[PDB]
Nucleic acid binder design. Structure first.
Lengths: 244, 161, 158, 167
RNA sequence: GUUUGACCUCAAAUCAGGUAGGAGUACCCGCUGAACUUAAGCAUAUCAAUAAGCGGAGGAAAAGAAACCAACCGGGAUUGCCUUAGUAACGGCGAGUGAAGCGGCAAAAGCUCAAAUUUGAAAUCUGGUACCUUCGGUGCCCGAGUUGUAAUUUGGAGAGGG
RNA sequence: GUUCUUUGUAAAGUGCCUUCGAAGAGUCGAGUUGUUUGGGAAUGCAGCUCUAAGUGGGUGGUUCCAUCUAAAGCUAA
RNA sequence: AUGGUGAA
């Protein structure tokens, strides 16, 4: 319906070209690292950056230990059409939906994949209390409804539903899922699929009179907190994801 | 009467300005106005009639937060009986066996459940479906709590008295 | 019909060129009363306890006119809806005689938004940073072909 | 006797603000003519109109394109004295606190959404936690009742026997 | 973009901050304004550029610092008196009408704007609120103002610099 | 007469050199209609009709010379 | 003549 301006499409093309150039280099570097081509690379090892509150940064070497992680969509870059290489990864992880989240388990192979799509999302280690609150106060669950259709992803209304769906691995209540998510249990993958999305509440959701100023303040604070480094060797940036 | 204008004069662009006023020093140096204002503000700060922003930072983020630190009611032993227009809040009465584990005699039968479901809103004085749940986990989730309490809030002050 | 001098307005900067000019002008918003007051108070507090000229757009009619005829101003904006039209009839011809490029923009209210004033009826810029000097020069060059060459017969259309 | 329309016309107040004032004054409905005359003097109405004017000022500042002016207007901006007259004594407030406790408990469990600010939910949760800590320290609870709609908790604060529902 | 915001024009309020009516009226500043009455006559001449009529101020008012008067070897604001002078001048040159410079005295204060960009910072002012030492002093807010509030300056020049 | 601030790289007083260095328009005035007039050269006032320029304009002068810069405003005696 | 009064 709306007419497309030349400037907008040109900007989209330029941003897409820049992102594709970055992604190709990132993929080549990751493939070389997987092949142990340490002969000539910027950094043999990898780091994970952390930003905390006045504002200071922290950097630590990557440790080969799995840990529960939560990832949320950041709705950007603003004018970049997601390339198929990253679009497939986002679709598989089902984080394409704006403001949607999902829990994943950190692994040696997962970390390089996160590095490629790190700018597109925000990652971090949520606290146990935050995880429990989110699980007991949010989370979609796909099931077959009464008899016919399966559009009812609203909420974990009844514990008996969890017993019925699985029944075998002892997952009879929400607390079982919470324990299996916090702990490195085998059922983490099973319950992770059971709760594909985590539709966290979005921002102010409007413009209004004061809401416009609030949105502007949020946008300008995002640049002072989040930043598109675009470096192929950019360390993963961790933040206090629990602040929500 | 109606003919196009002529650019006989505007045709030739001017080469040099029309004035040779010497440039004042203020055009290349900070003017006295800023220094005078700064000195006036310094005098005000010294005289104590104005405060620097450094102390205002504390006054805004380390002061005015001390609120509610006073006895709102204090010593008081009298009621609104002076004016009898203070209608009682009509708080809900105690429960009527609407428990998760009520007596087995109040276990709604399928016919009773169907009859209750047939009745619509505003005619459900018995607004609960009693049932027995020997296990706490078996208790189903309740989503109608918000609606019922919203209706109560509406009826609190949206009814003639 | 209107005289030849009138109707020289109603031909103004286009949406794209006007938007670009506003974007360039929006980068040189003069310090407002609150900003100047807080800056001066901070400076006084620093002095009590113990930079080049601030580039900004010129908008005052008297100041703008004084800048014109001296070749100091590099660009001038003219409001088309000025109620005392006599105040603006001579500005385009005077600028053309002085060879200073100018671009007419619709709306005195819109013009004033860039200087935190209800209405100014005029706007111009003389000083410009290096990062924006190239943009200003390109905008000035584009305005020439956009306006002067497109309305060389403005003397017509009584 | 006057009606809601007459009260709104005389007070020159919005419907939402009128409802807020009625709630803060308990003006149950037709409307009490003798009480609307007393309502004519209300600093809360002055604050509401000042906020309404500030909203227009902020919209103007945003339209003019001045973030600093908007920030200054927003930064440069209560029910404490209202409670003085609608709760003559502490026992009355304790008796009427049932609805307040129920509302706070209900809202504490409400997930954050666009229609409800997350700050409100956080404040409600903090208030509920404070109330729970106070009850535990004083051990004033006497009975517990479990229901399909929650647990019908009750307290005997000064013998009130208030019954607050925990969702 | 079928919304939304900037403004500009004019209304609405037993909203806040403000002023005028009238009286008095000898004199002052303007408008309108006749007749009896007279030389032998009424359109100029004369009652009269008056009384009455109308509008607006003070204890005094108006005027007041030249687009002045003069022709000399020049004076240097306005105003009142004597003189200039019952002269110059006007009029069936008669009857009658009727000025001014210069001179002397009383008193002599001269000034403020438009007309040049502050532009390296509308820095100006009213109003509201909060305090004080209240014919006023200050923190904060809004509005007025850029179609112009702020340094001098009315030709005796003045301004930017050394 | 006795005191507090005297502040701030502020104001402004004077000798010499350099560069700039504005001026009041339906206004003056030509004609006409009524008025003022002691007014021989309107001396003015109001309408009507057109409207002037800055090495210019106003009032006088004997060939031409003498003096100011209206069309903005304030001020006790 | 100017300023006013009321009415077969």
């Amino acid at each position: 319906n709306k007419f497309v301006r030349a400037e907008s499409i040109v900007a989209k093309t330029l941003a897409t070209s820049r992102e594709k150039e970055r992604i190709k280099r990132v993929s080549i570097l990751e493939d070389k690292k997987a092949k142990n081509e340490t002969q000539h690379i910027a950094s043999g090892k990898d780091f994970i950056l952390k930003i905390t509150e006045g504002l200071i940064r922290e950097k630590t070497t990557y440790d080969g230990k799995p840990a529960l992680l939560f990832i949320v969509r950041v709705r950007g870059p603003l004018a970049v059409n997601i390339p198929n290489k990253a679009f497939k990864i986002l679709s598989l992880l089902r984080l394409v939906e704006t403001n949607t989240g999902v829990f994943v388990k950190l692994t040696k192979n997962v970390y390089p994949l996160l590095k490629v799509i790190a700018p597109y999302v925000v990652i971090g280690k949520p606290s146990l209390s935050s995880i429990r609150s989110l699980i007991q106060k949010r989370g979609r669950i796909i099931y077959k409804g009464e008899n016919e259709a399966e559009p009812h992803e609203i909420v974990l209304n009844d514990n008996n539903i969890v017993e019925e769906q699985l029944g075998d691995h002892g997952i009879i209540c929400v607390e079982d899922i919470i324990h299996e998510i916090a702990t490195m249990g085998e059922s983490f993958s099973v319950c992770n699929f059971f709760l594909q999305p985590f539709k966290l509440n979005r921002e102010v959701s409007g413009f209004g009179s004061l809401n416009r100023l609030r949105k502007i303040k949020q946008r300008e604070a995002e640049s002072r907190t989040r930043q598109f480094s675009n470096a192929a060797t950019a360390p993963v940036i961790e933040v206090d994801i629990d602040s929500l | 009467p109606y003919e196009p204008l002529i650019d006989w004069f505007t045709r030739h662009e001017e080469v040099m300005p029309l004035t040779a006023v010497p440039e004042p020093k203020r055009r290349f140096v900070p003017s006295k106005n800023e220094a005078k204002r700064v000195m006036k503000i310094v005098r005000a700060i010294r005289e104590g009639r104005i405060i620097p922003p450094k102390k205002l930072k504390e006054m805004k983020e380390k002061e005015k937060i001390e609120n509610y630190q006073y006895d709102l009611w204090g010593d008081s032993t009298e009621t609104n009986d002076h004016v009898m227009h203070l209608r009682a809040p009509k708080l809900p009465p105690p429960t009527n066996e609407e428990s998760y584990n009520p007596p087995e005699e109040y276990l709604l039968s399928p016919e009773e459940k169907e009859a209750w479901e047939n009745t619509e809103y505003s005619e459900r004085e018995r607004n609960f479906i009693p049932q027995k749940y020997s296990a706490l986990r078996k208790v189903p989730g309740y989503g109608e709590s918000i609606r019922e309490r919203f209706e109560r809030s509406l009826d609190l002050y949206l009814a003639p008295r | 019909k209107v005289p030849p001098t009138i109707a020289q307005f109603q031909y103004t900067l286009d949406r794209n060129t006007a938007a670009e000019t506003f974007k360039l002008f929006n980068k040189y918003r003069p310090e407002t009363a609150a900003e100047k007051k807080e800056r001066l108070t901070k400076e006084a507090a620093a002095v009590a306890e113990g930079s080049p000229k601030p580039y900004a757009v010129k908008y005052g009619l008297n100041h703008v006119v004084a800048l014109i005829e001296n070749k100091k101003a590099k660009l001038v904006l003219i409001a088309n809806d000025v109620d005392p039209i006599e105040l603006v009839v001579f500005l385009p011809a005077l600028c053309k005689k002085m060879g200073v490029p100018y671009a007419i923009v619709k709306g005195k209210a819109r013009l004033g938004t860039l200087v935190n004033q209800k209405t100014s009826a005029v706007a111009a810029l003389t000083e410009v940073r290096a990062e924006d000097e190239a943009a200003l020069a390109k905008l000035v060059s584009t305005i020439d072909a956009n306006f002067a060459d497109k309305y060389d017969e403005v003397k017509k259309h009584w | 006797f006057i009606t809601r329309s007459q009260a709104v016309r005389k007070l020159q107040v919005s419907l939402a603000d009128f409802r807020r004032l009625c709630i803060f004054k308990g003006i149950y409905p037709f409307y009490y003519a003798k009480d609307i005359q007393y309502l004519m003097h209300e600093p809360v109405l002055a604050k509401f109109r000042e906020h309404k004017t500030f909203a227009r000022k902020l919209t103007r500042a945003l339209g003019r394109g001045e973030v600093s002016s908007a920030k200054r207007l927003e930064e440069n901006r209560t029910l404490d004295h209202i409670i003085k007259e609608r709760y003559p004594s502490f026992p009355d407030a304790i008796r009427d606190i049932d609805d307040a406790l129920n509302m706070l408990f209900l809202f504490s469990n409400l997930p954050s959404t666009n229609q409800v600010s997350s700050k409100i939910i956080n404040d409600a949760q903090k208030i509920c936690n404070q109330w729970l800590a106070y009850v535990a320290k004083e051990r004033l609870v006497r009975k517990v009742f479990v229901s399909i709609k929650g647990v019908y908790y009750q307290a005997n604060i000064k013998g009130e026997e208030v019954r607050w529902l925990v969702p």
